[PDB]
């Protein structure tokens, strides 16, 4: 008809809000990772690098067992040593970049604990179903 | 296309149902004729206009469903 325009919901422009709003727009960003004589080799190498990075990410997600979904809970408890704060402030005041800058130091130990809990769980489930 | 299938929450399966209702606007017909006589190619040719409209509905339906059930499992 006449009068109605066209509205999008696009790229990272939603990266200046609290935690709650931004999480509503994850999917689009996740979709924009695999879009698509001395110079051809360069672009070919770049494409190969991008594919390798994507596969690395996919495997690293697969190991934890939360594959096939955008959100996933886990059993590791949260040590208060890192940043006490409290839930309401964390979810209604800060932006993503500030949080990332805030939790840059203790990154690897969390991955280690996640991996360990996942492994113990699958082993327990495996012998458990071995009993049945 | 693997990723595109993955987004719609039907990974690892060759068949998958979903909640979006079927509007009669696109093509009324009826079950018997479509599942008996029509072939694949002609069907594709005849529904070649309303693909992009369809994809977004599935996407948003999955997103809303997952967000809703997250709270239910959270209060558990």
């Amino acid at each position, epitope marked *: *008809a*006449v*009068g109605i*325009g066209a509205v*999008f919901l*696009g790229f990272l*422009g939603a990266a200046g809000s609290t935690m709650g*709003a931004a999480s*509503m727009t994850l999917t689009v960003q996740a979709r924009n990772l695999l879009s698509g004589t001395v110079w051809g080799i360069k672009q070919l190498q770049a494409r190969v690098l991008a594919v390798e990075r994507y596969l690395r990410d996919q495997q690293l997600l697969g190991i934890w067992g939360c594959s096939g979904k955008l959100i996933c809970c886990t059993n590791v408890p949260w040590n208060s040593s890192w940043s006490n704060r409290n839930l309401s402030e964390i979810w209604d005041n800060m932006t993503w970049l500030q949080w990332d800058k805030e939790i840059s130091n203790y990154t690897q130990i969390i991955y280690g604990l996640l991996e360990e809990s996942q492994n113990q769980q699958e082993k327990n489930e495996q012998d458990l179903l071995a009993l049945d | 296309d693997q990723q595109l299938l993955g987004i719609w929450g039907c990974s690892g399966k060759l068949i998958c149902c979903t909640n979006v209702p079927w509007n009669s606007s696109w093509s009324n017909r009826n079950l018997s004729e479509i599942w008996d006589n029509m072939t694949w190619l002609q069907w594709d040719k005849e529904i070649s206009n309303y693909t992009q409209i369809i994809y977004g509905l599935l996407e948003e339906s999955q997103n809303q469903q997952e967000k809703n059930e997250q709270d239910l499992l959270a209060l558990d």
Partner: antibody
Framework: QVQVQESGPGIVKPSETLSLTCAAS??????????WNWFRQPPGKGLEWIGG????????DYNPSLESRVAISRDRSANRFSLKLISVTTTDTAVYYC?????????????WGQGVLVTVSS | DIQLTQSPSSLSASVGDRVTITCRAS??????LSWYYQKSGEAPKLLIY???NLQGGAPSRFSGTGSGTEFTLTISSLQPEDFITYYC?????????FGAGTKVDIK
């Protein structure tokens, strides 16, 4: 999700110039077109469309009857839009509204705010 | 300008009744038509779009149909709030027109 408010004088003498203004927001959406519209309704009769303008252009479109007595402007710094009306008369005494209509895929939303009264008297 | 005629101009029935209103266009407008509902002391809010796309949040008792130069709205059961003003209008090329409107009353 957008709120809208109106701003203008309460009483203006006949034949003077009436200036009205209305603000707007962009909501969670990132980029698109918001066809802003100005509507009116006199008491005790049907509504009537005054005019429209895109949020990314300046070719303000007016109804054929009141082409000569309407001017529409937009301000990007203030993200506002204003209307000027000349040769005011007692008939213009009415409730006026600024509205926007989204353009999402096959939904056709619409907001209407609250509007404001305008009275012409001596 | 495309002229739209509403019928009945006024009506009065009891609560819980089934009623029907009609809006006739002066010419063929296809299906780019929508009805807005409004009450005293409030700005209008859209009721139905295209006469075949139910607006979210509306009660299901309202149904809309029609085509060409004739469109119809049927209410299965009256409610105290249903006694309100309605306006059929056309979202077509310029200009833009709106109906006279109909008021439902208690009897």
């Amino acid at each position: 999700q957008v709120q809208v408010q109106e701003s203008g004088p309460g009483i203006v003498k006949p034949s003077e110039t009436l200036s009205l203004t209305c603000a707007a927001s962009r909501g969670p959406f990132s980029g698109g077109h918001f066809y802003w519209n100005w509507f009116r309704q006199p008491p005790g009769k049907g509504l009537e469309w005054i005019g429209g303008i895109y949020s990314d252009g300046d070719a303000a479109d007016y109804n054929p009857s009141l082409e000569s007595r309407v001017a529409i402007s937009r301000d990007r710094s203030a993200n506002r839009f204003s209307l000027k009306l000349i040769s005011v008369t007692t008939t213009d005494t009415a409730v006026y509204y600024c509205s926007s209509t989204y353009s999402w895929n096959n939904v056709w939303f619409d907001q209407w705010g609250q509007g404001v009264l305008v009275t012409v008297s001596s | 300008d495309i002229q739209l005629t509403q019928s009945p101009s006024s009506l009065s029935a009891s609560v819980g009744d089934r009623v029907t209103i009609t809006c006739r266009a002066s010419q063929d407008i296809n299906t780019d038509l929508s009805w807005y509902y409004q009450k005293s002391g409030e700005a209008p809010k859209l009721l139905i779009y295209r006469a075949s796309n139910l607006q979210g949040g509306a009660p299901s008792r309202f149904s809309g149909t029609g085509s060409g130069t004739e469109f119809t709205l049927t209410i299965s059961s009256l409610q105290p709030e249903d006694f309100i003003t309605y306006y059929c209008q056309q979202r077509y090329s310029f200009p833009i027109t709106f109906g006279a409107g109909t008021k439902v009353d208690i009897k």
